[PDB]
Write an enzyme that holds these catalytic residues in place. Sequence first.
Site, PDB file in Angstrom:
ATOM      1  N   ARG A  30       0.909  -1.070  -0.106  1.00 51.62           N
ATOM      2  CA  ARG A  30       0.144  -0.041   0.091  1.00 51.62           C
ATOM      3  C   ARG A  30       1.047   1.259   0.045  1.00 51.62           C
ATOM      4  O   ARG A  30       1.803   1.377   0.793  1.00 51.62           O
ATOM      5  CB  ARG A  30      -0.771   0.006   1.187  1.00 51.62           C
ATOM      6  CG  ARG A  30      -1.389   1.370   1.767  1.00 51.62           C
ATOM      7  CD  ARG A  30      -2.911   1.435   0.910  1.00 51.62           C
ATOM      8  NE  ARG A  30      -3.469   2.644   1.687  1.00 51.62           N
ATOM      9  CZ  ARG A  30      -4.262   2.774   2.367  1.00 51.62           C
ATOM     10  NH1 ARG A  30      -4.891   1.608   2.871  1.00 51.62           N
ATOM     11  NH2 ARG A  30      -5.057   3.893   2.629  1.00 51.62           N
ATOM     12  N   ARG A  86      -5.395   2.357  -4.180  1.00 56.77           N
ATOM     13  CA  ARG A  86      -4.670   1.595  -3.202  1.00 56.77           C
ATOM     14  C   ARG A  86      -4.688   0.069  -3.273  1.00 56.77           C
ATOM     15  O   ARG A  86      -5.873  -0.638  -3.803  1.00 56.77           O
ATOM     16  CB  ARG A  86      -5.103   1.792  -1.490  1.00 56.77           C
ATOM     17  CG  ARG A  86      -6.742   1.706  -1.125  1.00 56.77           C
ATOM     18  CD  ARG A  86      -7.612   2.749  -1.906  1.00 56.77           C
ATOM     19  NE  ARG A  86      -7.193   3.809  -1.341  1.00 56.77           N
ATOM     20  CZ  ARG A  86      -7.368   4.244  -0.336  1.00 56.77           C
ATOM     21  NH1 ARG A  86      -8.118   3.803   0.704  1.00 56.77           N
ATOM     22  NH2 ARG A  86      -6.974   5.535  -0.196  1.00 56.77           N
ATOM     23  N   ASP A 117      -6.749  -1.860   1.580  1.00 50.75           N
ATOM     24  CA  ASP A 117      -7.254  -1.042   2.741  1.00 50.75           C
ATOM     25  C   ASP A 117      -7.712  -2.161   3.661  1.00 50.75           C
ATOM     26  O   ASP A 117      -8.772  -2.697   3.307  1.00 50.75           O
ATOM     27  CB  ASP A 117      -8.236   0.021   2.559  1.00 50.75           C
ATOM     28  CG  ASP A 117      -8.588   0.900   3.369  1.00 50.75           C
ATOM     29  OD1 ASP A 117      -7.657   1.399   4.205  1.00 50.75           O
ATOM     30  OD2 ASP A 117      -9.784   1.142   3.485  1.00 50.75           O
ATOM     31  N   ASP A 129      -9.808  -2.044   7.190  1.00 47.70           N
ATOM     32  CA  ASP A 129     -10.231  -1.145   8.085  1.00 47.70           C
ATOM     33  C   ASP A 129     -11.235  -1.965   9.157  1.00 47.70           C
ATOM     34  O   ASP A 129     -12.091  -2.881   8.768  1.00 47.70           O
ATOM     35  CB  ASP A 129     -11.374  -0.161   7.527  1.00 47.70           C
ATOM     36  CG  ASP A 129     -10.844   0.904   6.749  1.00 47.70           C
ATOM     37  OD1 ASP A 129      -9.582   1.117   6.698  1.00 47.70           O
ATOM     38  OD2 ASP A 129     -11.392   1.624   5.967  1.00 47.70           O
TER      39      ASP A 129
END
Length: 157
Positions: A83, A92, A95, A97
């Site tokens: 990344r 990207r 990711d 999260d």
Amino acid sequence: MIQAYLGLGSNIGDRESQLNDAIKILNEYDGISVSNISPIYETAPVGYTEQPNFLNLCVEIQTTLTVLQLLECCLKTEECLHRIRKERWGPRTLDVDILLYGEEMIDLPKLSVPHPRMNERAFVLIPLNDIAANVVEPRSKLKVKDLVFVDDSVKRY
Ligand SMILES: Nc1ncnc2c1ncn2[C@@H]1O[C@H](COP(=O)(O)CP(=O)(O)OP(=O)(O)O)[C@@H](O)[C@H]1O
Ligand SMILES: N#Cc1ccc(CSc2nc3c(=O)[nH]c(N)nc3[nH]2)cc1
Ligand SMILES: [Mg+2]
Ligand SMILES: [Mg+2]
Ligand code: NA
Ligand code: NA
């Protein structure tokens, strides 16, 4: 043992392969076990300029890590997938999260859980509903199935 939910996105490179590698890496940390994976959705970027379309999914984990230990593993997985973090936001490779960590609410400089934008994001809620329809989002106190809404910019891949 805590039930947590992660949101994964990729909009550059081989998006599907990168998401599948990320899941494998996440599952290989001690203290994290992937117990469910949503279908993959192709989604229109939100919150920025025109950008390449994402593949997004959600993962259920069973974890014995603290939420900050979990964040470290998520960020390391991103590093594993190369990344890039330039001066401006851009596409990207990965990711990762943290969406939900049990029913906990955490508000630290480096960590906000539940994810602050999740309740207004179809690219989160639609896949999250596939695996966590009955899980309670603790700020709103609603189940995910009562938050999810139809969005034609999110399609099964
Ligand atoms: N719930 C969460 N999950 C992951 N990172 C979080 C987080 N809450 C805060 N962060 C912080 O956000 C920092 C930057 O993350 P990025 O991954 O660069 C934001 P991103 O996900 O593009 O945007 P988004 O948060 O709108 O989805 C991380 O280093 C981390 O400390
Ligand atoms: N490229 C790009 C780029 C696009 C948007 C953003 C803001 S955060 C964000 N994450 C996602 C994501 O995983 N999927 C979608 N569909 N939109 C998002 N928006 C940041 C960078
Ligand atoms: Mg994100
Ligand atoms: Mg992130
Ligand atoms: Na593991
Ligand atoms: Na804060």
